[PDB]
Amino acid sequence: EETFFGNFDLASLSLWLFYGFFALLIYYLQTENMREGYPLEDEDGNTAANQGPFPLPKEKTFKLQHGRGELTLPGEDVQRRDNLALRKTAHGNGFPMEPTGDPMLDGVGPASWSKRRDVPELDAHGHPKIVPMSAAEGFGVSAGTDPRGLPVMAGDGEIVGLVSDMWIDEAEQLVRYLELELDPEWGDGKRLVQRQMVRIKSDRVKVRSIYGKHFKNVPKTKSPNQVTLLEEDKIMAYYAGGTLYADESRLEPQL
Amino acid sequence: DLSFTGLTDEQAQELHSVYMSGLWLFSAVAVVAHLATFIWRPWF
Amino acid sequence: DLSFTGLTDEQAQELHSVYMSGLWLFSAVAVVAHLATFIWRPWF
Amino acid sequence: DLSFTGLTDEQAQELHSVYMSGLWLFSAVAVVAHLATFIWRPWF
Amino acid sequence: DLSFTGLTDEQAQELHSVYMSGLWLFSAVAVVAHLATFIWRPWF
Amino acid sequence: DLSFTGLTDEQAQELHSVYMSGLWLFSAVAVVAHLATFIWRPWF
Amino acid sequence: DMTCTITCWGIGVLLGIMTTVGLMVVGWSFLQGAFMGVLAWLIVGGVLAVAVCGKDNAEQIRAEMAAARERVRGAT
Amino acid sequence: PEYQNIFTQVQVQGPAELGVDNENNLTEERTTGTGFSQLIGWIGNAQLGPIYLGWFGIISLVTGTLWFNIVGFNMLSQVGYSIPEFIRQLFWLALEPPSPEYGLRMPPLDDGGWFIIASFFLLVSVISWWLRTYQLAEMHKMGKHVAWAFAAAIWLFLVLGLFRPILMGSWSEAVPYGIFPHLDWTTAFSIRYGNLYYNPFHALSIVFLYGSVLLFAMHGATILAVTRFGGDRELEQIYDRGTASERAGLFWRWTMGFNATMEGIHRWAWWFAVLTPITGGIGILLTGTVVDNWFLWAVEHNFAPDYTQDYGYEAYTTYDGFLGR
Amino acid sequence: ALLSFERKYRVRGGTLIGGDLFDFWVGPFYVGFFGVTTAFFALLGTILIFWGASQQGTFNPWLINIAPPDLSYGLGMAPLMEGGLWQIITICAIGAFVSWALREVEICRKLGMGYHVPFAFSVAIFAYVTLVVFRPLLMGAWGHGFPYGIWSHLDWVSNTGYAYLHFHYNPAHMLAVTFFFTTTLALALHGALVLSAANPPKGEEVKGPDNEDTFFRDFIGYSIGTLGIHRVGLLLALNAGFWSAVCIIISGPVWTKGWPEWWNWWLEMPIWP
Amino acid sequence: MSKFYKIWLIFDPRRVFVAQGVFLFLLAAMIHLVLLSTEHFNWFELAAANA
Amino acid sequence: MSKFYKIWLIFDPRRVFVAQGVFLFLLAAMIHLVLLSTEHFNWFELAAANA
Amino acid sequence: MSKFYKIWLIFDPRRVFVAQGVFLFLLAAMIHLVLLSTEHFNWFELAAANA
Amino acid sequence: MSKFYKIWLIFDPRRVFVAQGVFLFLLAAMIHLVLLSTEHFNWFELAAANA
Amino acid sequence: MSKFYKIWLIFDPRRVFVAQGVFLFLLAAMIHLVLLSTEHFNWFELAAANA
Ligand code: BCL
Ligand SMILES: CC[C@H]1c2cc3[nH]c4c(c3C)C(=O)[C@H](C(=O)OC)c4c3nc(cc4[nH]c(cc(n2)[C@@H]1C)c(C(C)=O)c4C)[C@@H](C)[C@@H]3CCC(=O)OC/C=C(/C)CCC[C@H](C)CCC[C@H](C)CCCC(C)C
Ligand SMILES: CC[C@H]1c2cc3[nH]c4c(c3C)C(=O)[C@H](C(=O)OC)c4c3nc(cc4[nH]c(cc(n2)[C@@H]1C)c(C(C)=O)c4C)[C@@H](C)[C@@H]3CCC(=O)OC/C=C(\C)CCC[C@H](C)CCC[C@H](C)CCCC(C)C
Ligand SMILES: CC[C@H]1c2cc3[nH]c4c(c3C)C(=O)[C@H](C(=O)OC)c4c3nc(cc4[nH]c(cc(n2)[C@@H]1C)c(C(C)=O)c4C)[C@@H](C)[C@@H]3CCC(=O)OC/C=C(\C)CCC[C@H](C)CCC[C@H](C)CCCC(C)C
Ligand SMILES: CCCCCCCC/C=C\CCCCCCCC(=O)O[C@H](COC(=O)CCCCCCCCCCCCCCCCC)COP(=O)(O)OC[C@@H](O)CO
Ligand SMILES: CCCCCCCC/C=C\CCCCCCCC(=O)O[C@H](COC(=O)CCCCCCCCCCCCCCCCC)COP(=O)(O)OC[C@@H](O)CO
Ligand SMILES: COC(C)(C)C(=O)C/C=C(\C)CC/C=C(\C)CC/C=C(\C)CCCC/C(C)=C/CCC(C)CC/C=C(/C)CCC=C(C)C
Ligand SMILES: COC(C)(C)C(=O)C/C=C(\C)CC/C=C(\C)CC/C=C(\C)CCCC/C(C)=C/CCC(C)CC/C=C(\C)CCC=C(C)C
Ligand SMILES: COC(C)(C)C(=O)C/C=C(\C)CC/C=C(\C)CC/C=C(\C)CCCC/C(C)=C/CCC(C)CC/C=C(\C)CCC=C(C)C
Ligand SMILES: COC(C)(C)C(=O)C/C=C(\C)CC/C=C(\C)CC/C=C(\C)CCCC/C(C)=C/CCC(C)CC/C=C(\C)CCC=C(C)C
Ligand SMILES: COC(C)(C)C(=O)C/C=C(\C)CC/C=C(\C)CC/C=C(\C)CCCC/C(C)=C/CC[C@H](C)CC/C=C(\C)CCC=C(C)C
Ligand SMILES: COC(C)(C)C(=O)C/C=C(\C)CC/C=C(\C)CC/C=C(\C)CCCC/C(C)=C\CCC(C)CC/C=C(\C)CCC=C(C)C
Ligand SMILES: [Fe+3]
């Protein structure tokens, strides 16, 4: 086989064509991932002077189900929090912020939640997706240890109440939440725990993230039969913030 | 009667009677075939 | 009368009769074939 | 008295009778086969 | 009366009585076989 | 009384009383076996 | 009863180790004895986790469940 | 320690799901009958079945079983119909492609004719499974990404078995049907044409394979760390951004200076995986037809290293000194 | 510059060591104690690589080669030009990788997340330390490591495999290749399914998880689910890297002959006639 | 023997017809291939050899 | 032995028949192949050598 | 020995019958194959030896 | 000895019956094969060498 | 002593009884196999050598 010029043959032409195509593909891939969080801002909420080397993408529209409307991106930030109890620790950019009051109650840091829609997520038939087991026709524990009726122990070693029910996702057949009834000494009413934050044993159920005295301030659902996305985010973030804010020794260097 | 398929006795007799008449045709052609081949090339 | 299947005692007799008839036909054909094979090439 | 399967005593006796009757014939056939094999080629 | 299995004393007595019968049969047959084998080819 | 298991101070006495009788029997049998094997093939 | 299943799988692992050492005393090499040990484990330990762990406890409960399955059929 | 989410603590079971439907009436061709496995349910879903049976799937199954039996029966007959020897040498037997002397013509059945008949049945089977993957998206009213990703691998499949033998002028250039024999083909192909390391498209294919495995370790680990905020429900996170997506993005932004979105990471994954067989097939198609020695090509284009030291064991030691004598 | 939702997460605390002495950001990057150790080690390693390139005589990125010492030096230290620079760069690289993992740990702690990512990165660190520290120590000389060169570290791979005649017949290499191919097929399927659910034909509504579960049971009769697929992908990737480390550490210190000969145990099993 | 019709009160004819058809063709193709695999009964080589 | 018909009160006829058919065909095929694997009983080779 | 019929008060007959049906055939096949692996008791080789 | 019958108050008879059957058969097979692995106690070779 | 019976107030009779059986059989098999691996204490070879 011959060359076009010098040492240039068909393999070289193919290689350079792939180089050009890959450069265009990298541009497309990086531009496609900029539909959330832009334009950039500084630490005072103003638009930043630098916006980077890539321009922003054009708009796409999503047609949602069950008559929820349309979504156009990139657009305005509708999940933005309004009044955050935070304080700057420096005059410029690049330094951390300090909570003004109680970080766990104010939803800041690892306890932060995003302002999602105030409606439950639906399944294919238009029904709420997560339902307590006491109202779910045909479901039963088929494997593992059933946690209903067991006491719950906090991270500091206190018994705070008993498991009363389980909330399940019927479409995917999975347990999502555990429902806890509190003793009068540790609060009143019922609270929820996400399944990924518990360890179920033979005689107890352990939640290590928070202590007993923190169990009365867990956010509460409005209806006893359904939970919206906003409540889900606030409940999950509350438990997640305890990994750092439960004790002062969890925040300081471990060395 | 015992029917796991929901056919009746007579409907079963009708199907079988038709089925055996094709079975016999298949078996007959195959015997004329084997005979021609043994005469053409024996294997015993 | 014990029944794990759902059949009756009367129903489980005609079925056995037909099954045994088929079994005997199969065994007779096999016996004839084995005799022919033994005559053609013995093994004992 | 004690039952893990739901069968009563009479049902158990009835089942065991047929089980033993069907188990003895298998052993008789095996004994005849072993005698024929021993005479054809002993091993002791 | 401690019973993890959920059985009464009389039922356990009956079950163990018949259980032992099977052991003592299996053991006698094994003894006869071992004696015959030792007479055939000793190992001690 | 300490009782991690679901037992009392009377059930445990009986349990140990018979368990120890079976321990002594396996041990008696093992001793006789070892005595026979030492006569047949000493290791000391 | 997931705890009886794990026990049964461990008795299979132990039988496999014993199969290797036994074939080696009789004249086989390690890897030859260990292939046979792996199959003893998988076949026997699997068989025992179906059969033994499937003789689940229930006593007159077992009886009634079975006598009622014997009522499903009869009209099926 | 905290729960890690690798095994489910407690399982729940309900009525079996039979699937969604629309005006295309997918129910008519679905089998009835489902099962449940509690062993699998420790990791994923426990339900088994049902499945859809169209004509494409049936044709694919029938023609693929035919290919398997022509190969298996040829392998069995090569050994004299001895079952224990058939089992003993299963990994070593194969159905060999034709001899080079026959070109692109039809070879004798003993020397590659059965190989060509079986190759035609495997071809038909594979193209039918792809038409099924396209039809089901169309019937489900979804995008065609799965079919395109499958066609990406079918491209290299066809290059290895169909296109390159035709451009080279011999059916003898195809791959044998065997376990060990096909690995010997790989080594012999690499040796015959210089060194396949120095083929640039082979290097690009390795780049994309390494990148695809690094990305499932990163994506799987990242999604499992945000499951305490509902992060495994990805579609609703796309339609309504939550804190799980924000934390997942900020982890990588603070780690390496840039990040992705919930929807956009799947495009990255789709492209890296798809790019492996495309570059591989382009590299294979250029061998023998254009370039015959890749190491000499590298020497020509000046990316072959040079070494100063000598060759030989006695330039470094002595035979007696290596034995301890 | 910050994203639209990033300011509320930038709080103080969650460090393993250093307190607020290194608790800040440079641009988008977070620095801590392990960000200062990573920078030092990586910069020293790169500068030494380029000094070695200058002394070799070529600056061509394809042709730069820094190599381990001769086998005659054993486990001692060689002169810096005859293989000692390789040893120093190896130490620097180990330090940089460990500092990177411990920095990821602090970022995870600050964000309140799980520690899955550093644990997954530890597997890749283990495959590299097996290639440059564990196999060489067992075999008795640092000269068994691979050289630092873009096209010269492929020559090492080629020569190391033909030193056992036919490397494809290594039993643990066959397991590792299968894991690699399965991870890529599963990544392709997962990406395709999610994109096809989120991007329907023009004029149609978007789909949910029910639709995804249904398509896959219709296609192959089973669906792992939205949570199972990530567990399976992680497990496949980690199994791929672990089996790779095993395939290399047995090739040298455990087996000396060709890899086909290892299969003899199957060919002469006593059951066969 | 005269009551063999009752197999159609136990087995669905639709399934067994398809099963039979597939089984029958696959058996016939295997015999022809075994015949083609022999040195004495390959009728294509006989035509070349005979003349 | 006159009460062997009671097996049908334990096992469902439908399943047992399918298993019996599969078992019988597989056993017959295995035995024919085993005969084909020898030198004495390979009737194709015997026909080849007897002419 | 007259109380053995109570075994069915403990065991389910269907499971026992299936297990025994599998076990008996597996054992018979194992013995028939063990005989064929020797020289004295291989009836296929003996027939050729005495021809 | 007169109170060993209480062993069935702790052990479920079904489980122990299944386990004992499996154990006994496996022990018998292992012992028979161990005897087959020797030279003086192989009854298949003794028949060959005594005829 | 005389208070060893209180061992059954801490340990469960059913867990102790299964573990002890497994341990005892494994130890007996191990000891028998260790004896079989020697020269002076292998009775199968002793029988052959004697006779
Ligand atoms: C001596 C060995 C040679 C070598 C010779 C080759 C050869 C020859 C080839 C590879 C190829 C590849 N090599 Mg290389 N390679 C070497 C060393 C390496 C090393 C290393 C040392 O670490 C690595 C990482 C690799 C890796 C790779 C991959 C990147 C690439 C395969 C691409 C792909 O998509 O695979 C995945 C495989 C596929 C997509 C195959 C398609 C499968 C089809 C679609 C299956 C259809 C369905 C099926 C029929 C049904 C089955 C039954 C079902 C159950 C129903 N090579 C050395 C130098 N390499 C290939 C390539 O592309 O070269 C550029 C190739 O042909
Ligand atoms: C790369 C992915 C591979 C794959 C995976 C896959 N397929 C699967 C499964 C999995 C993991 C199943 O679990 C499921 C199954 O049940 O298989 C027996 C199945 C399946 N894939 C099938 C088809 C299929 N898959 C294909 C492809 C593939 N699927 C790939 C090889 C193809 C081809 C050619 O491309 C085909 C044609 C069927 C064999 C089966 C469809 C499921 C079905 O029909 O289930 C009916 C339900 C039943 C009652 C049967 C279940 C068996 C038991 C009696 C139920 C009780 C469960 C028990 C406790 C455990 C046993 C289950 C085991 C699978 C663990
Ligand atoms: C982008 C490149 C990657 C990739 C992707 C990829 N592969 C794919 C797809 C995609 C996107 C599919 O959609 C398709 C699929 O169905 O996936 C589930 C597939 C697929 N890739 C496959 C294989 C495969 N892909 C490979 C590679 C890759 N595929 C790359 C890593 C490789 C290798 C060598 O690394 C293999 C071996 C199949 C599982 C499947 C294609 C299915 C197909 O075409 O099947 C034809 C079927 C037959 C042969 C007929 C059936 C006959 C059988 C011999 C027996 C009966 C079937 C039974 C279910 C199996 C036996 C089990 C028993 C227990 C019953
Ligand atoms: C299952 C194991 C898979 C895996 C996992 C893995 N790797 C990871 C991660 C995970 C989960 C991360 O989180 C982490 C990351 O941040 O990714 C963006 C990372 C990472 N793995 C990377 C790459 C990488 N991973 C690879 C593979 C894999 N990693 C496996 C497939 C490969 C190859 C060869 O296949 C490469 C090249 C990095 C991009 C990244 C983070 C490493 C890093 O930045 O470390 C800090 C160090 C520096 C910035 C520079 C160090 C400079 C040295 C001092 C000098 C250089 C010397 C060097 C030895 C020369 C080599 C020359 C070569 C030509 C031979
Ligand atoms: C030659 C130059 C590199 C130096 C040479 C040595 C290293 C070589 C290896 C890898 C290079 C990776 C370097 C990436 C570092 C990025 C640093 C960063 O963070 O850069 C961002 C800008 O980057 C990005 O946005 C991502 C860039 C792509 C990432 C790498 C892709 C690897 C793809 C494929 C694998 C590559 C193998 C080759 C295939 C050959 C193919 C023929 C600033 O911030 P930003 O906010 O995101 O700005 C953007 C926007 O937002 C505007 O607003
Ligand atoms: C600490 C010691 C270092 C260790 C020493 C080891 C040496 C090697 C290691 C790392 C090299 C990467 C260094 C670059 C990182 C720059 C830091 C950074 O990114 O800083 C940003 C500033 O941006 C930039 O400086 C933009 C960088 C452009 C990237 C190029 C894009 C393609 C590139 C690649 C494509 C690859 C394809 C194939 C390749 C072949 C073909 C290239 C602050 O961002 P910001 O203020 O938040 O906002 C602003 C934001 O939007 C964007 O301006
Ligand atoms: C040569 O080099 C090598 C390494 C090989 C060596 O050999 C090194 C060796 C050493 C370094 C050896 C060191 C050895 C020791 C330190 C040994 C120590 C041993 C003990 C302390 C053993 C303790 C054993 C305890 C036992 C047997 C206790 C029995 C108790 C009971 C039977 C009573 C419990 C029962 C009941 C009923 C409790 C009552 C319950 C109620 C509810 C009241
Ligand atoms: C050498 O050794 C090897 C291994 C190579 C072998 O070759 C071994 C081979 C074997 C072991 C082979 C075994 C072969 C068999 C057991 C074969 C059996 C074959 C049959 C039972 C064939 C039956 C065929 C029956 C047919 C064709 C019947 C009917 C056909 C019809 C068209 C009937 C039509 C029916 C209608 C219309 C129904 C009417 C409908 C109504 C509603 C009334
Ligand atoms: C490995 O060792 C070697 C190679 C030596 C061997 O080959 C060893 C081989 C063996 C150990 C082989 C063992 C073989 C057997 C145990 C064989 C058993 C065979 C049978 C029991 C066959 C059974 C049945 C066959 C048939 C034809 C039965 C029935 C036919 C029917 C048509 C019944 C029809 C019934 C109807 C329609 C009922 C309808 C009635 C109503 C009332 C509705
Ligand atoms: C050389 O050494 C080696 C290792 C090679 C060996 O070969 C070692 C071999 C052994 C150690 C072998 C051991 C073998 C055994 C322990 C064998 C045991 C066999 C039996 C107990 C067999 C029992 C068979 C019983 C049968 C065939 C019963 C049949 C019953 C029926 C046909 C009727 C059933 C129907 C019923 C009950 C319906 C009634 C229903 C009602 C409702 C009334
Ligand atoms: C030489 O060295 C090596 C390692 C090679 C060896 O070979 C070592 C070998 C050993 C160490 C071997 C060890 C062997 C043993 C420990 C053997 C022990 C054997 C027994 C304990 C056997 C007991 C058997 C008893 C039986 C089978 C009991 C009962 C059976 C039945 C009664 C059946 C009937 C059941 C019914 C009716 C249920 C009753 C229910 C009612 C409700 C009434
Ligand atoms: C006998 O026992 C039974 C019955 C159980 C069996 O059936 C047993 C069967 C087996 C034991 C089977 C074993 C099978 C294997 C080990 C198979 C291995 C197969 C491969 C590794 C195959 C690789 C194939 C192909 C490769 C690597 C690349 C490309 C191929 C193609 C594109 C093929 C397509 C061919 C075409 C398009 C040419 C067709 C020709 C025309 C003229 C149109
Ligand atoms: Fe994902």
Q: What is the 3-state secondary structure (H, E, C) of H142-154?
A: CCCHHHHHHHHHH
Q: Cα(I219)–Cα(I211) distance, rounded to whole angstroms?
A: 12
Burial of H2 (0-12, 13-18, 19+ CB in 10 A): middle
Residue A188 DSSP SS3: coil
Task: Name the closest-CA residue to atom 20, ligand 4.
Answer: I121
Give the rounded distance of the alpha carbon of I193 from its chain centre.
Answer: 27
Instruction: Go through chain E and tell me how many residues it has.
Output: 44
Q: Which residues pair with I30 in a beta bridge?
A: I25
Q: Is residue H266 part of an annotated ligand binding site? A: yes
**Contact between residue H120 and residue H114 where contact means Cβ atoms under 8 Å apart:** no
Residue I24 DSSP SS3: strand
* Residue H178, ligand 12, Cβ within 6 A: yes
* Residue H69, ligand 12, Cβ within 6 A: yes
Task: Please compute, for residue H231, the number of CA atoms within 13 A of its CA located in the half-sphere on the CB side.
Answer: 26
**A174-182 and A151-153 strand pairing:** unpaired
Largest CA distance in chain H: 87
Q: Is residue C26 part of an annotated ligand binding site? A: no
Q: Cα(I62)–Cα(H305) distance, rounded to whole angstroms?
A: 8
- b/e map of I57-78 (b: 16 or more CB within 10 Å)? eeeeebbbbbbbbeeebeeeeb
Could you give the angle at the alpha carbon of D6 between the alpha carbons of D3 and D10, nearest 5°?
A: 80
Task: Please compute, for residue M18, the number of CA atoms within 13 A of its CA located in the half-sphere on the CB side.
Answer: 23
Supply the DSSP symbol for I207: -
Q: Which amino acid is at D13?
A: Q
Q: Cα(I28)–Cα(A50) distance, rounded to whole angstroms?
A: 12
Looking at G1-76, list the stretches that DSSP marks H as alpha helix, in order from N- to C-terminal side: 3-26, 30-51, 61-72
Residue E38 DSSP SS3: helix
Instruction: Go through chain M and tell me how many residues it has.
Output: 51
Q: Which residues contact H73 (CB under 8 A, 6 or more apart)?
A: J30, J33
Nearest CA to M6 out of N10, F10, E10, F21 is that of: E10
Please give the interface size between D and E, counted as residue pairs whose CB atoms are below 8 Å apart. Answer: 6
Tokens of G11: 């008795």
Using a CB cutoff of 8 Å and minimum separation of 24, what contacts does H64-70 make? Answer: H64/H121, H64/H122, H64/H125, H66/H118, H66/H121, H67/H118, H67/H119, H67/H121, H67/H122, H67/H125, H69/J26, H70/H95, H70/H114, H70/H117, H70/H118, H70/H121
* Residue L44, ligand 11, Cβ within 6 A: no
B41 to J41: CB separation less than 8 angstroms, yes or no: yes
ω into I28 cis (within 30 of 0): no
Q: Cα(H16)–Cα(H25) distance, rounded to whole angstroms?
A: 19
Experimental method used, please?
Answer: cryo-EM
Burial of D18 (0-12, 13-18, 19+ CB in 10 A): middle
Looking at the CA of L7, which ligand is closest?
A: 11
Mutate which of B5, B10, B29 to test chain J, going by most J C-beta atoms within 10 A?
B5
Q: Cα(H13)–Cα(A175) distance, rounded to whole angstroms?
A: 10
Residues of chain E in contact with residue D2, where contact means CB-CB under 8 angstroms, are 7, 11, 15
Give the rounded distance of the alpha carbon of F5 from its chain centre.
Answer: 22
Residue in K closest to C18 by C-alpha: K5
Q: Cα(H111)–Cα(H115) distance, rounded to whole angstroms?
A: 8
**L6 touching chain E per CB within 8 A:** yes
- DSSP H or E run through H11: strand H10-13
M44: nearest CB among L10, L11, L40: L40
Task: Name the closest-CA residue to atom 9, ligand 6.
Answer: I42
Which residue in the block uniquely carries the two structure tokens 């089998």?
H31
Looking at D1-44, list the stretches that DSSP marks H as alpha helix, in order from N- to C-terminal side: 9-40
Q: Which residues contact I198 (CB under 8 A, 6 or more apart)?
A: A62, H235, H238, H263, I206, I207
Task: Name the closest-CA residue to atom 23, ligand 5.
Answer: H258
Tokens of A158: 């206190």
Nearest CA to B15 out of H41, A14, D10, J11 is that of: J11
Residue I3 DSSP SS3: coil
Q: Cα(A119)–Cα(H290) distance, rounded to whole angstroms?
A: 63
- DSSP H or E run through I30: strand I29-31
Nearest CA to A155 out of A91, A101, A209 is that of: A209
Q: Cα(H47)–Cα(H43) distance, rounded to whole angstroms?
A: 12
Distances (CA, A) of G5 to G10, G29, G40, H42, H98: 9, 31, 16, 14, 53
Looking at chain C, list the stretches that DSSP marks H as alpha helix, in order from N- to C-terminal side: 11-40
**Contact between residue C18 and residue D27 where contact means Cβ atoms under 8 Å apart:** no
Residue A144 DSSP SS3: strand
Taking phi first (over 0 means left), then psi (-120 to 50 degrees means alpha), and beta for anything else, what does residue I140 get?
left
- b/e map of H70-108 (b: 16 or more CB within 10 Å)? bbebbbbeebebbeebbebbeeebbbbbbeeebeeeebe
**L32 touching chain D per CB within 8 A:** no
Supply the DSSP symbol for A152: E
Q: Which residues pair with A131 in a beta bridge?
A: A168
Tally Cβ neighbours within 10 Å of residue L49: 10
Looking at the CA of H123, which ligand is closest?
A: 12
Q: Which residues contact H152 (CB under 8 A, 6 or more apart)?
A: H274, H277, H278, I188
Tokens of I11: 């709080």
**Contact between residue I197 and residue H191 where contact means Cβ atoms under 8 Å apart:** no
- DSSP H or E run through L34: helix L13-36
**G68 touching chain C per CB within 8 A:** no
Largest CA distance in chain A: 90
Q: Which residues contact J7 (CB under 8 A, 6 or more apart)?
A: B16
Which residue in the block uniquely carries the two structure tokens 């979804």?
H142
Locate the DSSP E strands across chain A.
60-63, 70-73, 86-88, 97-99, 130-132, 140-144, 151-153, 159-169, 174-182, 190-194, 199-200, 205-206
* Residue A53, ligand 6, Cβ within 6 A: yes
Sign of CA dihedral F9, F15, F18, F22: negative
Give the rounded distance of the alpha carbon of N23 from its chain centre.
Answer: 7
Task: Name the closest-CA residue to atom 53, ligand 2.
Answer: H35
Looking at I72-144, list the stretches that DSSP marks H as alpha helix, in order from N- to C-terminal side: 85-111, 116-129, 135-139
Q: Cα(H201)–Cα(H198) distance, rounded to whole angstroms?
A: 9
**A151-153 and A205-206 strand pairing:** parallel
Q: Is residue N40 part of an annotated ligand binding site? A: no
Residue G29 DSSP SS3: coil
Task: Name the closest-CA residue to atom 22, ligand 5.
Answer: H258
Q: Which amino acid is at A166?
A: M
Q: Cα(A14)–Cα(B35) distance, rounded to whole angstroms?
A: 65
Instruction: Go through chain D and tell me how many residues it has.
Output: 44
**M39 touching chain N per CB within 8 A:** yes
Tokens of M24: 């006994």
CA distance M34 to chain D (A): 19
**I269 touching chain G per CB within 8 A:** yes
Q: Cα(I44)–Cα(I92) distance, rounded to whole angstroms?
A: 7
Nearest CA to I189 out of I212, I209, I214 is that of: I212
Q: Cα(I116)–Cα(I125) distance, rounded to whole angstroms?
A: 15
Distances (CA, A) of I125 to H253, I119, I120: 22, 10, 9
* Residue D15, ligand 10, Cβ within 6 A: yes
Tally Cβ neighbours within 10 Å of residue I131: 18
Residues of chain B in contact with residue J8, where contact means CB-CB under 8 angstroms, are 5, 7, 11-12, 15-16
J5: nearest CB among B5, B13, B41: B13
Q: What is the CA radius of gyration of chain G?
A: 19
Q: Is residue N32 part of an annotated ligand binding site? A: yes
Residues of chain C in contact with residue D15, where contact means CB-CB under 8 angstroms, are 2
**Contact between residue I101 and residue I125 where contact means Cβ atoms under 8 Å apart:** yes
Distances (CA, A) of J13 to J8, J39, K17: 7, 41, 14
- DSSP H or E run through H265: helix H264-285
Locate the DSSP E strands across H24-151.
35-36, 47-48, 94-95
CA distance K11 to chain L (A): 7
Could you give the angle at the alpha carbon of A178 between the alpha carbons of A173 and A183, nearest 5°?
A: 160
Distances (CA, A) of C23 to C16, C17, C30, J10: 10, 10, 11, 17
**Contact between residue A74 and residue A56 where contact means Cβ atoms under 8 Å apart:** yes
**Contact between residue A73 and residue A35 where contact means Cβ atoms under 8 Å apart:** yes
